[PDB]
């Protein structure tokens, strides 16, 4: 006769978003089980996005275009600040950001957040480009995820490898599921979101003591970035292929990325030559984006699913009673290129929805 918890939650997805949601829910006292295909130990898996990020904090919208985005970014920055002392985050001082025009600098909304924010002289920008410098924060994407996972372990969360094809499979002994499935949200019956889209990112992992972060959007026909991370490693990138699922390495893209990046900062080379760059790995990830922006909202759903709820529902088109429970589905996906830098704020919004839902339905 043991007192048992009535605060059970399934988190579907183990990328940085499910992990951070899970961690805040667990700290709040929820009993959390994580169900996912891809787990933090799968550091070279291409079927989720989280191993492949920089990951730094680089705002991409105006306050007006991305009010939630900015709120989430601002909150995650404070958290990363708190992680510098133990090394789970790293200052990228004197980051330089180059854009085509004043528009590309997004109203400078974040200037009070990133220290030493200031405009660059045109002597310190590529030709025709405008620029600012500031100090921002970075995490080692796969290690940061494993760190979150350890924190979850200690709070008693559990992990289970599973690939779900229909919602009832996730409502596994719980009446609330957190859906943090990235691109998978499109092909799971009960979610079916056609708006989910990938945005392909190829990068080159480079061995280099280069400690400066440079980003250049001033050339539409060649996005370039250098993002340092702990371990004497930098990530050189350059692609944004919207709707592109190709997982294979483009050899021509290798050269365009390294040339542009070299341009940006020859010290990523052993001798300022393309040929002096010490390549560790060629990488391709697909950012899990969504037309209409990230989806963070709670929905009420009746189970089991019928073919009129989902084109992908299992069994025969004809469905009826055979019970019929109602559960809560809290969406958290389609963060595109900003999942790490928005992750802690997003998880905060997620846990507020869960608190909310439990107050209303589940007791």
Ligand X SMILES: Cc1cc2nc3c(=O)[nH]c(=O)nc-3n(C[C@H](O)[C@H](O)[C@H](O)COP(=O)(O)OP(=O)(O)OC[C@H]3O[C@@H](n4cnc5c(N)ncnc54)[C@H](O)[C@@H]3O)c2cc1C
Under the criterion CB under 6 A, does residue 225 sit at the interface with ligand BE2? yes
Q: Is the dihedral of CA 61, 133, 102, 107 positive or negative?
A: positive
Please check if 339 is assigned to a binding site.
yes
Catalytic-role residue among 269, 341, 342, 343: 341
| Strand pairing report for 8-12 and 214-216 | unpaired
Among 78, 311, 325, 326, binds a second copy (CB under 8 A): 311
Q: Is 56 in the site for ligand X (CB under 6 A)?
A: yes
Please pick, from the candidates 66, 131, 237, 304, the single residue that binds ligand X as defined by CB under 6 A: 237
- Interhelix angle 16-27/339-360, nearest 10 degrees: 40
With CB under 8 A as the contact rule, which of the stretches 69-77, 108-116, 270-278, 345-353 interacts with a second copy?
Answer: 270-278
Of 264, 255, 256, which Cα lies nearest the Cα of 216? 264
Tell me whether residue 166 is one of the annotated catalytic residues: no
Among 88, 97, 260, 287, binds ligand X (CB under 6 A): 287
At closest approach, how far in Å is the CB of 79 from ligand BE2? 17
Q: Are 53 and 337 in contact (CB under 8 A)?
A: no
Is there a catalytic annotation at residue 56? yes
Q: Which of 170, 215, 224, 357 binds ligand BE2 (CB under 6 A)?
A: 215
Out of ligand BE2, a second copy, ligand X, none, which partner does residue 225 contact, by CB within 5 to 8 A per kind?
A: ligand BE2
- Say how many C-beta atoms besides its own lie within 10 A of residue 218's C-beta: 21
Reference 336, options 285, 298, 281; nearest CA is: 285
Can you tell me the distance from the alpha carbon of 235 to that of 240, in angstroms, rounded to the nearest whole number? 15
Angle between helices 339-360 and 67-83 (to 10 degrees): 110
The sign one gets for the Cα dihedral 59, 65, 69, 74 is: positive
Residue 122 touches which member of a second copy, ligand BE2, ligand X, none, C-beta under 5-8 Å by kind: none
Spell out the residues 6+ positions from residue 213 whose beta carbon is closer than 8 angstroms to its own: 56, 92, 95, 96, 136, 138, 225, 226, 227, 228
Asked whether residue 21 is marked as a ligand-binding residue, the answer is no
Of 130 and 236, which has the nearer Cβ to ligand X? 236
Residue 51 contacts ligand BE2 per CB under 6 A: no
* Binding partner selected for residue 315 from ligand BE2, a second copy, ligand X, none, CB under the kind-specific 5 to 8 Å limit: a second copy
Bridge partners (DSSP) listed for residue 178: 11, 330
Residue whose structure tokens are 């510098």:
84
Q: Could you list the residues that contact ligand X (CB under 6 A)?
A: 12-18, 36-38, 48-50, 52-56, 162-164, 180-182, 184, 188, 201, 203, 237, 285, 287-288, 333, 335-341
* Interface residue list for a second copy (CB under 8 A): 44, 46-47, 163, 165, 183, 186-187, 192, 194, 196, 244-249, 251, 254-255, 270, 273-282, 284, 307, 311-318
> Which residues are tagged catalytic?
56, 337, 341
């Amino acid at each position: 006769l043991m007192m048992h918890s009535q605060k059970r939650v399934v988190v579907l997805g183990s990328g940085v978003i499910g992990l951070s949601s899970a961690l805040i829910l667990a700290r709040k006292g929820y009993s959390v089980h994580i169900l996912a295909r891809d787990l933090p130990e799968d550091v070279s898996s291409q079927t989720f996005a989280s191993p492949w990020a920089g990951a730094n904090w680089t705002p991409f919208m105006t306050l007006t275009d991305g009010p939630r985005q900015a709120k989430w970014e601002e909150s995650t920055f404070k958290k990363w600040v708190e992680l510098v002392p133990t090394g789970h985050a790293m200052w990228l001082k004197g980051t330089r950001r180059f854009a085509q025009n004043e528009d590309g600098l997004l109203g400078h909304w974040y200037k009070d957040i990133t220290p030493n924010y200031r405009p660059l002289p045109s002597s310190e920008c590529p030709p025709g480009a405008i620029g600012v410098t500031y100090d921002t924060l970075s995490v080692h994407a796969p290690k940061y995820c494993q760190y979150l996972a350890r924190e979850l372990q200690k709070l008693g969360a559990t992990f289970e490898r599973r690939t779900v094809t229909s919602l009832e499979q996730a409502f596994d002994g719980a009446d609330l599921v957190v859906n943090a499935t990235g691109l998978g949200a499109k092909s799971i019956a009960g979610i079916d979101d056609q708006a989910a889209e990938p945005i392909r990112g190829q990068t080159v992992l480079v061995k280099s003591p280069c400690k400066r972060c440079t980003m250049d959007s001033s050339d539409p026909a060649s996005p370039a970035y250098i993002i340092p991370r702990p371990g004497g490693e930098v990530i050189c990138g350059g692609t944004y292929g919207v709707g592109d699922w190709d997982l294979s390495v483009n050899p021509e893209t290798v050269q365009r990325i390294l040339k542009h990046c070299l341009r940006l900062d020859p010290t990523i080379s052993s001798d300022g030559t393309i040929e002096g760059i010490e390549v560790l790995r060629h990488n391709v990830g697909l950012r899990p984006a969504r037309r209409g922006g990230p989806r963070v909202e709670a929905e009420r759903i009746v189970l089991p699913l019928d073919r009129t709820k989902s084109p992908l529902s299992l069994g025969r088109g004809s469905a009826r009673a055979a019970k019929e429970k109602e559960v809560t589905l809290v969406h958290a996906y389609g963060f595109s290129s900003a999942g790490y830098q928005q992750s802690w704020g997003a998880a905060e919004d997620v846990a507020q929805l869960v608190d909310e839902a439990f107050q209303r339905y589940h007791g």
